[PDB]
Write a protein that binds this DNA or RNA. Sequence first.
RNA 1: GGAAAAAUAAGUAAACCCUACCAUUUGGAACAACAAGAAGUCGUAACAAGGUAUCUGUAGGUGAACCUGCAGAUGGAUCAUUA
RNA 2: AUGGCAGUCACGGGUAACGGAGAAUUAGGGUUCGAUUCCGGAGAAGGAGCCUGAGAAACGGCUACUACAACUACGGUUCGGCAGCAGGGAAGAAAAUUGGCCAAUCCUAAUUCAGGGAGCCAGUGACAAGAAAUAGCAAGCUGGGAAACUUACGUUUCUACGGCAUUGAAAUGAGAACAGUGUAAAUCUCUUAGCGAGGAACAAUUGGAGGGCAAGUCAUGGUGCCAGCAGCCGCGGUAAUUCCAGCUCCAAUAGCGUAUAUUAAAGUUGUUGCAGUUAAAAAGCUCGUAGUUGAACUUCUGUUCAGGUUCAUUUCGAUUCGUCGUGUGAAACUGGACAUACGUUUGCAAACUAAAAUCGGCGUUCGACUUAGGGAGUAAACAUUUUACUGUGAAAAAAUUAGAGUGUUCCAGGCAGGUUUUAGCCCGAAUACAUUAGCAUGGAAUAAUGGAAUAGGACUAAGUCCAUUUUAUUGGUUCUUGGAUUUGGUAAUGAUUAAUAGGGACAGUUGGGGGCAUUAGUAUUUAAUAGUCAGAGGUGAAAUUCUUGGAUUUAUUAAGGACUAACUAAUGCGAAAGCAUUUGCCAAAGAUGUUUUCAUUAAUCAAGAACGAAAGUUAGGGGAUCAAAGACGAUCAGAUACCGUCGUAGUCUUAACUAUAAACUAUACCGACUCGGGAUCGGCUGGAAUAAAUGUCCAGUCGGCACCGUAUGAGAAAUCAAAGUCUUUGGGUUCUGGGGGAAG
Lengths: 129, 150, 141
Amino acid sequence: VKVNILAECLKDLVNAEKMGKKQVLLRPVSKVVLKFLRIMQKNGYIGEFEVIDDHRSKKVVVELIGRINKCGVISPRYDVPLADFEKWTNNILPSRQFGNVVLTTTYGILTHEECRKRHTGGKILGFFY
Amino acid sequence: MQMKGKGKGISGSALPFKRRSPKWLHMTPSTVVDLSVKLAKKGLTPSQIGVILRDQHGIPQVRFLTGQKILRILKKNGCAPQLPEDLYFLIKKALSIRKHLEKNRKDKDSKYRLILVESRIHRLSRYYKLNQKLPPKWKYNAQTASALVQ
Amino acid sequence: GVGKPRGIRAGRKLARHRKDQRWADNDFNKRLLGSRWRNPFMGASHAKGLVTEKIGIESKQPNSAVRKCVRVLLRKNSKKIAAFVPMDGCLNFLAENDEVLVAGLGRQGHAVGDIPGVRFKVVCVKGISLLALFKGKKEKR
RNA sequence: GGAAAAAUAAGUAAACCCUACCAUUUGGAACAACAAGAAGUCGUAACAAGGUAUCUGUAGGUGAACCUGCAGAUGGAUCAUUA
RNA sequence: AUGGCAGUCACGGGUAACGGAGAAUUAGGGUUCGAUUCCGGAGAAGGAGCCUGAGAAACGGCUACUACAACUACGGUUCGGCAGCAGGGAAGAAAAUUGGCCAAUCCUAAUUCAGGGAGCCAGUGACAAGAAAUAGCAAGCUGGGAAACUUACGUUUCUACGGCAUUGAAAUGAGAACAGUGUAAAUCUCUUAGCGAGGAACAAUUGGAGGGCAAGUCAUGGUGCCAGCAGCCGCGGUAAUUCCAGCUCCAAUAGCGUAUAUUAAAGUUGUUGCAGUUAAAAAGCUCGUAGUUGAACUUCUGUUCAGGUUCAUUUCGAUUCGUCGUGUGAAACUGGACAUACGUUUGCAAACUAAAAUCGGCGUUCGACUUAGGGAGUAAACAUUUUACUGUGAAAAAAUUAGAGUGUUCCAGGCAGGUUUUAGCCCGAAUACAUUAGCAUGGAAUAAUGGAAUAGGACUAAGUCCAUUUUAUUGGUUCUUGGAUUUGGUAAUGAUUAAUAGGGACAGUUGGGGGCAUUAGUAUUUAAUAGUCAGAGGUGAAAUUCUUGGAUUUAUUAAGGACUAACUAAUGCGAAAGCAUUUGCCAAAGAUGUUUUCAUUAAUCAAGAACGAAAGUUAGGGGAUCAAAGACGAUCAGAUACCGUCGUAGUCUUAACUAUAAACUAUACCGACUCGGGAUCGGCUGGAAUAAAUGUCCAGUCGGCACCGUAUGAGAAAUCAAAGUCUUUGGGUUCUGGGGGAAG
Ligand SMILES: [Mg+2]
Ligand SMILES: [Mg+2]
Ligand SMILES: [Mg+2]
Ligand SMILES: [Mg+2]
Ligand SMILES: [Mg+2]
Ligand SMILES: [Mg+2]
Ligand SMILES: [Mg+2]
Ligand SMILES: [Mg+2]
Ligand SMILES: [Mg+2]
Ligand SMILES: [Mg+2]
Ligand SMILES: [Mg+2]
Ligand SMILES: [Mg+2]
Ligand SMILES: [Mg+2]
Ligand SMILES: [Mg+2]
Ligand SMILES: [Mg+2]
Ligand SMILES: [Mg+2]
Ligand SMILES: [Mg+2]
Ligand SMILES: [Mg+2]
Ligand SMILES: [Mg+2]
Ligand SMILES: [Mg+2]
Ligand SMILES: [Mg+2]
Ligand SMILES: [Mg+2]
Ligand SMILES: [Mg+2]
Ligand SMILES: [Mg+2]
Ligand SMILES: [Mg+2]
Ligand SMILES: [Mg+2]
Ligand SMILES: [Mg+2]
Ligand SMILES: [Mg+2]
Ligand SMILES: [Mg+2]
Ligand SMILES: [Mg+2]
Ligand SMILES: [Mg+2]
Ligand SMILES: [Mg+2]
Ligand SMILES: [Mg+2]
Ligand SMILES: [Mg+2]
Ligand SMILES: [Mg+2]
Ligand SMILES: [Mg+2]
Ligand SMILES: [Mg+2]
Ligand SMILES: [Mg+2]
């Protein structure tokens, strides 16, 4: 069946920027899918976006700037102590210059980087660069 | 698409947007609740009752109008169909198969088909039992089926 | 997904799988099955022995030659050994019944491409390194 | 009254034997067997539609490779012909 | 009484397995070891027993047995157990002196003085680690050069320079030594006088020179597939670039080869990070509990204040060899507050305001001082229970990292720095990491879990009953405090949507899906009824075969067993194997259609089951055709083979059993995406013509085989619309592979 729609939505989107789509329609959407989205948006990867009210679980449409190179999730969302960071930064990110490894915390959801600010982080969620 | 590594499609049914009751219709929740329980008393499936209220008395979605789902309405009014359509029917055909098999003790495609159908029933029991929506000592074997036949 | 399962709750599975699918390695399968202990040296690096006789063996495929070899009897092990005597005149020093020290040739298994069923090298005669006997100014008895 | 040897019963239980079983090592032969190699010997299976094809399964026969029946698959010697 | 444990691996077996601290290599993750200075455990020849004591089953104590060691006048005895040191024997690839002392570290005792193979000294000692010499300088000759002087090979000069069986004196440890230091003594080191270097010397090896793998293009000598080399390619058979050796070269260099186990290269065991059409690898196919994996909703949000933070700066003040302060904007953090909005009580502190009092001036203008009031400000009680994350408590020392620190550098020790305050001064022995399980604690995400649905819950008041603390104590009342009910009041009383998830209901319809019946049709045989006439049949040719007791042949008809033609095609259905004459029953299925219910019920799956052409098997049927074995002809040098004539088992069936097949798309299932295009099969919805057809066409569209074109997507390529969305390496799950042959 379906799982981690964040992943469903995410790749559907990558496939977008990769194919050169002008905009994308993500079918199954959730708070997570949206938060991640406004985090990419806030950092300037995706453009303006609209959430249509599917009386079941909303559908979102994201405008595509053309700067997204890749944005995926990470299989089981392992736990990650602040000490476990460089491991993943050198692992997932294409450089020490596009630090975008989204994590889930108790302090909500922060950028790979913000988690060092707040000083907590926790489970990995996804990445984008 | 259930027990099918190969076959799969989309039957239909998509509740329209507007969550309110149709304009043209006037019927205090109660009005319907009567028809519903009356119809039910005659011996009807909440599954079938709803069908009437749509085909016959233009009530698209009883839930939207009452703020009550059929089976609930029925249960509140003592008119609750003991065993759920779900299980009931599966067991029905599950049985029909057995009868046919007897006089055709050789029909293999049917032995198989029953195996699948009996398999499902064990899946519902697991479920309906876990939602304390069916006594734990429930057991469909051959006697549970013939028990309902009487 | 691929074959391997990616669950945070399914570590056990992956674990047992690796321990299992791992027997497919010979290097593993080898040391794991106390195989090293059953060879003629009994794991050992070297072994002493008595010369049972100097025999010669023929080269294989594109080569044709009389290889110098000594049949040795290992001490505590007590096995018949096929041992290749190195360099040129070498066998001229090995007197029958003397004590010899033998070691393998490149990873215990395949003999040098040329040799047939020989798996050992001879390094000492009466406890005198061969090389030593090979160069005049060194030693001789 | 204390108290040595002796003797006593239940007990801990050494060794030994018998009855089963486990583990680890190590052993054994003529004929036989296995391994590898070749311009040994007899033929030619396979490649080439390799004398009108291989190949899988199963069955039966034969100096030998293999042939043959039934059923498949092309990795075929076809990606094709109701007018 | 009958339990206790187990696939979340019991029980049992192996371990050249005593566990840790740690050790070796390491991008990350890992791989392999830990006999061995710390700690804990076990044991003293094997095994049991015991005395004694605060304390051991001790074992440098005892008893018996098994196997042993020492003496004997053979009666009997041993303070007989080295896995303590030093030594022998043994084993074996393999590990030092039967030395010295109590001086240092500690220990023991009645104990400042005694004893200690603990321990320290020394011997042996290329395990291993640190530093480091085997030469340096210059003249001259000379090659180079080179800058020059300058049409040519000639002079000046200088230089990164570089050569020499030519020159020359300075330098210096090895060495060897009176002294001093040091020491328990002795050895050595260190300081140091007399003595101490010029070519076989006072000294470099080891291992190579085809490729990988740095280095011979020697026309070198010997050898002639011999001797031998070679890690793997391969060298060698008379002109070897790999043998033997010379020469010259290269590499590491007081070191360098070799053997074996092991680390990395190994994305060649892969969680990160592989492969699985054809290279090894998807199971033939479905069901299915364990396991693994699971859709979406529940304070969003706004305004303002504040603390920093950053960043920006048509900018300000300071300092210099690079920072601070100030202002804006901005973001977000935070923390407040307030907004139907993360809490309540307490005590503290309190900050301001509304009243009332008192005090002063002239009821009021105002001011100081009181009660009430919450933020804010702490501590305890609450927010379903964990995961997970923060943080600190705990995680021995040594080791690793690491600060200070010129042990002559360094290993490394933890010391040392200044006598110019010197009967004293200054400064040190820091710090980090420590995951796994436990504790304290901050928390809002994901994830799981939970609360009110039979009803009952919640809050509140009263009534009643049970239980009960302090009231001295015992009763009896009351009462506080818990619990039980009944009632009445209050509250918007209490059940998220309905997943282009899944299960059911229903509706016409579609199919060579299946099981019973039934029913044909030619044909092959064989038989009857007639009909002739000499050949049929079979091959390339013929031959066994059949035939005027009539063949082959023609007509009619019958029996029988199997089979379903032509229509039948990249078209249909079935989980797969498989399934095509008619008609009738029996239970089943997809897809489409749904403003129907149910609402996570689900994906895949070890166990564990249902199927699974052929061929084959058991016991009965049946027996037409074809036909394994067999019998024959022919063909061949050979034919028990490819052709031909016959023929048994089977092939058909009932009931059992067998499970494999190039069981093939050689491409696991569920899910989402992404190129173009028509044509299909099934369903549906609009429309047009005829006509009013279970038809045709146009246009949609779900679902199903399949094809065409194409990819700045994949690949080793063939090729792949998926074999794609994988170094920009991670949706969920099952199975499989790890050079070849021996081998399934
Ligand atoms: Mg679907
Ligand atoms: Mg070769
Ligand atoms: Mg041969
Ligand atoms: Mg065959
Ligand atoms: Mg056979
Ligand atoms: Mg054990
Ligand atoms: Mg170990
Ligand atoms: Mg110890
Ligand atoms: Mg303890
Ligand atoms: Mg000793
Ligand atoms: Mg002392
Ligand atoms: Mg003393
Ligand atoms: Mg005394
Ligand atoms: Mg020493
Ligand atoms: Mg050294
Ligand atoms: Mg002296
Ligand atoms: Mg000189
Ligand atoms: Mg040399
Ligand atoms: Mg050499
Ligand atoms: Mg040479
Ligand atoms: Mg030569
Ligand atoms: Mg080397
Ligand atoms: Mg290997
Ligand atoms: Mg509040
Ligand atoms: Mg039918
Ligand atoms: Mg014929
Ligand atoms: Mg007939
Ligand atoms: Mg059809
Ligand atoms: Mg037909
Ligand atoms: Mg069966
Ligand atoms: Mg039979
Ligand atoms: Mg002939
Ligand atoms: Mg025949
Ligand atoms: Mg129509
Ligand atoms: Mg159409
Ligand atoms: Mg590939
Ligand atoms: Mg294509
Ligand atoms: Mg991968």
